[PDB]
């Protein structure tokens, strides 16, 4: 029984072996014995010269196409020697080369995660798959260096399995609204081939910031005979949350209504105006507690102090 080897993907006409050598035959000996390949299966991948006895490749030999994930990859055929009517079994092993990179089944993974997601939360990652075999197949995964997420991997029989992205440090949309990461999947060839997956994490807002007034206290001095409806003051509060969570409206806290009833606070603009006459007497000052509310139940406070001159 005769066994040869050849790497996949050689150029057509690449040398595989000499039948005459391995039968110990010369030129005249070889021809008189009338050798030829019996056509079957993939035998047409090889060409036998009946004068010299050389066996060469005849066409593209792709181990991935022939054998996929099976090992080893052997092409079998008979050589017929017409003289003695004897069949000679030939085996050629097709050697895997590293001509495939680990592939993901998508290019970009889009994730949405609340900024309040608890550390330890685990998300399973798309698998990398390498068409090569053995050392040339998938050997490892790598997640790009970053402060919030790390990679976890189960070390299985033939390689790594079930990659997961695990949250380590808390997210914060007010610091980073989006995170971009890269997952690579590498084989064990030399050099190593690495496939790539882009990961996009969108951080979903939580109402986790109260508004904040520009000042703890707003002082205003107003004329004794100021007309009704006069703008006295504009207050303002900012809020870093998103949408309704960061949208603030203004109002009086309900404390002493007999004071606050003399005034008007625009819920949207924060403009404070007098609604009723103000006395220089009876009340030198007029302290009032005000409130800034966002759209989802967080609040801030300030004091307004109106002095009549």
Give me the 198-227 binding string for Ca ion, x by CB under 5 A, dash otherwise: -------xxxxx------------------
Q: How far is the CB of 287 from its own copies (least distance, A)?
A: 10
Instruction: Please identify which residue in the block is written with the tokens 């009704």.
Output: 228
The answer to whether the annotation marks 116 as part of a ligand binding site is no
Asked if 98 interacts with Ca ion (CB under 5 A), we say: yes
Instruction: Please identify which residue in the block is written with the tokens 């792709």.
Output: 62
Pick from 85, 254, 268, 282: which binds its own copies (CB under 8 A)?
Answer: 254
Q: Of the ranges 13-21, 115-123, 156-164, 268-276, which one interacts with Ca ion (CB under 5 A)?
A: 115-123
The answer to whether the annotation marks 239 as part of a ligand binding site is yes
- The torsion angles phi and psi of 273, rounded to 5 degrees, stand at -135, 160
d(CA 106, CA 196): 10
Q: What is the DSSP letter of 103?
A: B
Q: Which of residues 92-111 bind its own copies (CB under 8 A)?
A: 105-106, 109
d(CA 172, CA 118): 12
Could you tell me if 66 and 7 are in contact, meaning their C-beta atoms sit under 8 angstroms apart?
no
79 binds, among Ca ion, its own copies, none (CB under 5 to 8 A by kind): none
Q: Which two tokens stand for residue 298?
A: 């967080």
Q: CA geometry: angle at 20 spanning 18 and 23, to 5°?
A: 110
Could you tell me if 263 and 229 are in contact, meaning their C-beta atoms sit under 8 angstroms apart?
no
Q: Give the nearer residue to its own copies in terms of CB position, either 17 or 195.
A: 195
Asked if 241 interacts with Ca ion (CB under 5 A), we say: yes
Q: Give the nearer residue to Ca ion in terms of CB position, either 99 or 152.
A: 99
Dihedral sign computed on CA atoms, order 57, 58, 59, 62: negative
For residue 228, whether the previous peptide bond is cis, meaning omega lies within 30 degrees of 0, is no
The answer to whether the annotation marks 206 as part of a ligand binding site is yes
Q: Give the nearer residue to its own copies in terms of CB position, either 43 or 291.
A: 291
Could you tell me if 213 and 300 are in contact, meaning their C-beta atoms sit under 8 angstroms apart?
yes
Pick from 133, 298, 304, 308: which binds its own copies (CB under 8 A)?
Answer: 298
d(CA 44, CA 20): 20
Give me the 11-40 binding string for its own copies, x by CB under 8 A, dash otherwise: ------------------------------
Closest residue by Cα to residue 123 from 162, 171, 74 = 162
Helix H or strand E encompassing 263:
strand 263-265
Chain breaks in the chain (C to N over 2.5 A) after: none
Residue ranges of the binding site for Ca(2+): 8-9, 62, 64, 96-100, 115, 130, 132, 136, 172, 174, 187, 205-209, 224, 239, 241, 245, 279, 281, 294
Residues in contact with Ca ion by the rule CB under 5 A: 8, 62, 64, 96, 98-100, 115, 130, 132, 136, 172-174, 187, 205-209, 239, 241, 245, 294, 298
Residue ranges of the binding site: 8-9, 62, 64, 96-100, 115, 130, 132, 136, 172, 174, 187, 205-209, 224, 239, 241, 245, 279, 281, 294
Residues in contact with its own copies by the rule CB under 8 A: 105-106, 109, 112-118, 121-127, 162, 203-204, 206-208, 210, 253-258, 289, 293, 296-299, 301
């Amino acid at each position: 029984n005769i066994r040869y080897s050849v790497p996949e993907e050689t150029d057509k006409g690449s040398f595989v072996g000499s039948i005459a050598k391995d039968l110990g035959l010369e030129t005249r000996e070889l021809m008189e014995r009338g050798i030829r390949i019996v056509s079957r299966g993939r035998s047409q991948l090889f060409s036998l010269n009946p004068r010299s006895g050389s066996l060469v490749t005849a066409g593209r030999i792709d181990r991935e196409e022939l054998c996929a994930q099976s090992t080893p990859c052997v092409v079998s055929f008979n050589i017929l020697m017409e003289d003695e009517m004897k069949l000679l079994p030939i085996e050629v092993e097709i050697i895997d080369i590293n001509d495939n990179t680990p592939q993901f089944q998508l290019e970009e993974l889009e994730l949405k995660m609340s900024e309040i997601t608890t550390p330890g939360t685990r998300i399973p990652l798309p698998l990398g798959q390498d068409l090569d075999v053995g050392i040339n197949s998938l050997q490892s995964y790598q997640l790009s260096a970053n402060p919030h997420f790390s990679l976890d991997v189960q070390q299985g029989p033939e390689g790594p399995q079930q990659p997961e992205m695990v949250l380590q440090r808390p997210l914060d949309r007010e610091k980073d609204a989006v995170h971009y990461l890269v997952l690579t999947a590498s084989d064990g060839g030399s050099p190593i081939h690495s496939g790539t997956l882009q990961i996009h994490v969108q951080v979903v807002d939580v109402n986790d910031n109260p508004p904040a007034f520009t000042k703890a206290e707003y002082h205003v001095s107003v004329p004794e005979n100021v007309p009704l409806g006069t703008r006295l003051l504009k207050v303002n509060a900012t809020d870093p949350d998103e949408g309704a969570n960061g949208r603030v409206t203004y109002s009086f806290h309900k404390v002493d209504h007999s004071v606050v009833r003399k005034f008007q606070l625009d819920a949207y603009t924060g403009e404070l105006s007098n609604k009723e006459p103000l006395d220089f007497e009876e009340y030198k000052v007029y302290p009032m507690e005000i409130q800034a509310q966002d759209g989802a139940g967080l609040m801030a406070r300030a004091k307004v102090l109106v002095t009549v001159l």
